[PDB]
Amino acid sequence: PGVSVRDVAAQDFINAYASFLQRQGKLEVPGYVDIVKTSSGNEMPPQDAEGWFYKRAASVARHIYMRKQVGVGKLNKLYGGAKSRGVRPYKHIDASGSINRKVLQALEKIGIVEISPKGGRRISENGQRDLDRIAAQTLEEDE
Template sequence: MADSTARTVKDVNPHEFVKAYSAHLKRSGKLFVASQELLLLGNLRISFYQMELPEWVDIVKTARFKELPPYDPDWYYTRAASIARKIYLRQGIGVGGFQKIYGGRQRNGSRPPHFCKSSGAISRNILQQLQKMGIIDVDPKGGRLITSQGRRDLDQVAGRVDVTIA
């Protein structure tokens, strides 16, 4: 693709985009402080919400079928970037949908394996944090949808990702 054309999240490699957006979230500090007052004009008060990392982020497993917590210390940023991308591409996904998306195979020893959902608390916490940041909003029909600010933010990061055509 030429550099003059605008790129969206759909135009770039998903893996590269999630890496870039998680680095953007970490670099911009949007996952640390709860809230900051940015502007106070008369009786107009604008708050800028940022994500806060939960205190359990280092010890929690991502699903019941997992044996250990993630090895990557920045896994929370990666999961938040992945959730934001999935809501960008398919609006209306809720906590139950993300439990199915991030679910996997439950090993049962000598018995056959079965599908098991992932943790709902992690998905719920990330969705609430993204909603406070203004990237997503609640859909009246159910689930979440991306806001115009969130779409602009994700498209800006997608524009910085290198597109390699094989």
Template sequence: MEFLGDCTYIHRAGKCNELADALPRTVCHDRANGVELRERMLCIAASELIGVLYRIVYLLLLEQCGRALLVKLWQHCTMRISAKDVDQSLLVNEIAAFLKKSGRISLPDWVDLVKTAPFKELAPTNPDWFYIRAAAIARHLYIRSPAGVGAFRKVFGGRQRNGSRPSHFVLASSGIIRKCLQALEEMKWIEKDPKNKGRVLTSTGRRDLDRLAAQVFKKNPSLIMKSCSNRR
């Protein structure tokens, strides 16, 4: 710290110990300027002290954990989880549980009677199958949209076994898919595409799916997709 006159000082790097000697010399000038300069010097000293503390903490972590673990910790703290980054089966179950818990979807009267497709022999045994089907539709629209009833009939279609005759691909039931789309549309998760046919995911639906994906990642951090780990 050097005095140049007119209450002007130069702060040298690594000379923090000279601040205490430089502060009393400010009283020889105007008191207002001296107080302002004293506050400025204290701010400089505090900022340098904080920087030194950050370096010490970083070196301690680097010595204890290693560089690779420290980089992974930084990526984990700054990484944004989306619906594409977690295990998709766990994500569908999480969305279905959220739909059931929220109570925003009303089940049809025929939910325990119908089959999901003509090639099925029996109705679904899972009592929450309607929520799972709606969750799968929402996840599909997150990844690929727009999509309508015809596209989802192909997605949920399957092989019909005809005994000794050859098997053939059969489309899924359209009524169930239409009811799921209408229920998601009432929740403001999806909307009709004004340009093309079908439905697209809204910003509200994308936000909620990302939040549910973050909850899945907190429960199972080791099951994150490779695309997310290579993104950083």
């Protein structure tokens, strides 16, 4: 029939890939998660305690795949939001870089993402090769 990445939905991909990462249990997270703010503007940590990092890794993996070169500061901007400075009007605030940095070196550690020229990250060959099993559930069910 023909196989391609983007020809599937985006909303079900991010969750399904994260469950793939969680089930495999190979992301190699040191464990200091569920402590830090995850964003200086976000005053509460993620609710999904057992997750929130398999999805974030899933989120960046799709993000780096669709882009060509990305950086730690760039992904902080992408995942950042608005900080409620109470009475002061809202302003855009970047996220903490450690969560984004250590989610990419984890992708490096397991083979999803390889370093790229001119600085930044890139979708790797191993990272793309495991998307076939990811899209298999989507294609089998609807057809």
